[PDB]
Design an enzyme around this catalytic site. Sequence first.
Site, PDB file in Angstrom:
ATOM      1  N   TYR A   1     -10.749   3.770   5.138  1.00  0.00           N
ATOM      2  CA  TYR A   1      -9.642   2.855   4.317  1.00  0.00           C
ATOM      3  C   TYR A   1      -9.850   1.656   3.323  1.00  0.00           C
ATOM      4  CZ  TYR A   1      -4.673   1.495   3.074  1.00  0.00           C
ATOM      5  OH  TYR A   1      -3.537   1.071   2.758  1.00  0.00           O
TER       6      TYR A   1
ATOM      7  N   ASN B   1       6.182  -9.242   7.352  1.00  0.00           N
ATOM      8  CA  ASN B   1       5.187  -8.405   6.862  1.00  0.00           C
ATOM      9  C   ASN B   1       5.050  -8.287   8.970  1.00  0.00           C
ATOM     10  OD1 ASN B   1       2.244  -7.003   7.513  1.00  0.00           O
ATOM     11  ND2 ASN B   1       1.107  -8.251   6.395  1.00  0.00           N
TER      12      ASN B   1
ATOM     13  N   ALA C   1       2.116  -3.146   3.164  1.00  0.00           N
ATOM     14  CA  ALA C   1       1.902  -4.654   3.084  1.00  0.00           C
ATOM     15  C   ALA C   1       1.475  -5.354   1.764  1.00  0.00           C
ATOM     16  CB  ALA C   1       1.420  -4.997   4.869  1.00  0.00           C
TER      17      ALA C   1
ATOM     18  N   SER D   1       0.809  -1.224  -0.318  1.00  0.00           N
ATOM     19  CA  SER D   1       0.306  -0.186  -0.071  1.00  0.00           C
ATOM     20  C   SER D   1       0.786   1.522   0.209  1.00  0.00           C
ATOM     21  CB  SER D   1      -1.049  -0.167   1.033  1.00  0.00           C
ATOM     22  OG  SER D   1      -2.215  -1.139   1.051  1.00  0.00           O
TER      23      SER D   1
ATOM     24  N   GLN E   1     -10.889  -5.017   0.253  1.00  0.00           N
ATOM     25  CA  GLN E   1     -10.546  -5.610  -0.032  1.00  0.00           C
ATOM     26  C   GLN E   1     -11.594  -5.887  -1.761  1.00  0.00           C
ATOM     27  OE1 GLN E   1      -7.975  -8.618   1.254  1.00  0.00           O
ATOM     28  NE2 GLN E   1      -9.067  -8.634   2.738  1.00  0.00           N
TER      29      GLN E   1
END
Length: 358
Positions: free
Chosen positions: A147, A340, A315, A61, A117
């Site tokens: 977000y 991550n 990530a 991101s 997503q």
Amino acid sequence: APQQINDIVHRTITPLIEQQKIPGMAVAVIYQGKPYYFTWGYADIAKKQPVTQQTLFELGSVSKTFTGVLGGDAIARGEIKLSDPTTKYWPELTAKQWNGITLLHLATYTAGGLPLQVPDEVKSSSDLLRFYQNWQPAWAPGTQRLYAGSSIGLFGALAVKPSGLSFEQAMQTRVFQPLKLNHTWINVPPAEEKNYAWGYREGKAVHVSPGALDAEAYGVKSTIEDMARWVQSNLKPLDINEKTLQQGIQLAQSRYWQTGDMYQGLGWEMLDWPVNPDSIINGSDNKIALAARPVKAITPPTPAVRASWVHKTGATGGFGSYVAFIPEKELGIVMLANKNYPNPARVDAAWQILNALQ
């Protein structure tokens, strides 16, 4: 490196890598406009390949900063306005929930609860139109920040349409090339394959998989040197000769909405300097970062601010990255890792380093 940088980097990163079991890592610190680099460990554990300043990492991101800047550049070119309805660029988007949703809202996660997503099963253009048509909002537009990759992802894909270029071609030609980012890629070329670090997720070597809106939301790969150069470009945009790109960098750091102590830009997020450290660190935890929050409609958007902490976490499955800079202090940091690990650990390390160098 100046000894004050060696000392704080080493004291900060060594326990970080140990605690988080990071296989490899690269850090750049920008100090008085110049970069200093550090690497640890392994790009490829199996092949014992070290991390170098030419090693490629998945930004995840942190790619959204590139999308926001490309988007600003399109605004500066007069190709788009953030006040344009989404439907100006995607007329097929006819379902009634799309009335009122503008490019601003896509870009800044305020469309009313588009999801984090895009589903794995959405592959085609046709699948993507069905996804957005059948989506129903949690909230009205321009009221809540949630977000979301499916939000800024779509902004990126729509934003390039008046240019007549694919997203990737536009990014190449309008952002990477002019900034001399010659080791930054949306698709890694064969000449670079040997520099592409593996990501590690539960001990397994992984690279990110293709997905819808991937280039737009999480698609970039880059080296520590190119990323330092990206931070330099965003710290001091006035050094950039291409007028629309200079202006687009500014617009991406413009403050479009306020939520608690944080401001939403285009891709970039910002807080007032001096920061409350505890706030940026605990705000970075997904319990907060991924939660819906009200936005102080800011009308009109507030212009970029030299006295700001500007940053973005990123990530993928096997990588974690972070970028932050403070334009007022001519200070910056990039941290790239091939694991991550939790956002607050990244921000805590970055704060430990940069506060010490002012």
